[PDB]
Structure 1
Amino acid sequence: HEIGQVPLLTLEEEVELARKVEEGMEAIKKLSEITGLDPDLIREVVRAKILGSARVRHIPGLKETLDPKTVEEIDQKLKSLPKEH
């Protein structure tokens, strides 16, 4: 019943989401270069804010314990970028 609550994608929507996922990964790669951070750490920080405050935990491999302090600190370094970055 719960899966049946998400409608199946149209060919356009399927391509759209897929497109956005690929572009986002490339964005995280670029955001790593600009910032001097770790692409995975950035990815988990990006992902943390999307899913919300609900899910926050240490991720095996990330260099920092991923607690609300670090996701705020790192998010503030990402939001300190110029408009084009």
Structure 2
Amino acid sequence: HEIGQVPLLTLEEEVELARKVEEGMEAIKKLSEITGLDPDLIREVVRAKILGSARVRHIPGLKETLDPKTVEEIDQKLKSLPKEHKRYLHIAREGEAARQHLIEANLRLVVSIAKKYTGRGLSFLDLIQEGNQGLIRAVEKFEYKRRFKFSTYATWWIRQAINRAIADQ
């Protein structure tokens, strides 16, 4: 019932979200150069403001405990940028927002792949969650320029994730 509350994407909508995610990744790379920060640290800080205060925790690999003090300090250095530099902050924020929607709109794909993998020692929902893990991998690696529909690329990463799950757990 919860997946059925996110409508499926139009070819246009699919390309639009995919486009914004790629541009945002490029924006974060550039924001690293300008600022002297870490591309991952910036990405987690950018991502923190989109999802909200709900999720705040230390992230394995990040140099800073990622508590409200550090995200305010670092966000204020990013919002203190000149107009031509600060345009990249707006890009990163919108990139993360579109990523969330892209993932959510493709959840039904994972179900249709996982249902075929039942009976191998993982419960249906365990297969869905591992399948969702691959979908996240697929959204980050997708290159929209190749003109392929998203469903084609995702399926490889989702199939890969379920099969690794069954073999490991």
TM-score range, shorter chain: over 0.9
Q: How far apart are 1:21 and its partner, in Å?
A: 0.1
SS in 2 for 1:56: coil
Distance 1:30 1:12 in 2: 27
SS in 1 for 2:83: coil
Q: Deviations over 1:44-70 (max 9, x none)?
A: 000000000000000000000000000
Distance 2:58 2:18 in 1: 28
Q: How far apart are 1:43 and its partner, in Å?
A: 0.1
Aligned identity (percent) is 99
Q: CA RMSD in A?
A: 5.0
* Unpaired stretches in structure 1, ≥5 consecutive residues: none
Distance 2:14 2:77 in 1: 33
Task: Compute the TM-score of the two structures, normalised by the length of structure 2.
Answer: 0.50
Distance 1:3 1:31 in 2: 34
Q: Deviations over 1:28-56 (max 9, x none)?
A: 00000000000000000000000000000
4+ residue runs over 4 A deviation: none
Larger radius of gyration: 2
Distance 1:14 1:28 in 2: 22
Distance 1:72 1:81 in 2: 15
Q: 2:41: which partner in 1?
A: 41
Aligned length: 85
Q: How far apart are 1:79 and its partner, in Å?
A: 0.3
Distance 1:31 1:81 in 2: 10
* Unpaired stretches in structure 2, ≥5 consecutive residues: 85-168
Any residues of structure 2 matched to 1:70-85 within 5 Å, and which? 70-84=70-84
Q: 1:15: which partner in 2?
A: 15
SS in 2 for 1:77: helix
Task: Compute the TM-score of the two structures, normalised by the length of structure 1.
Answer: 0.98
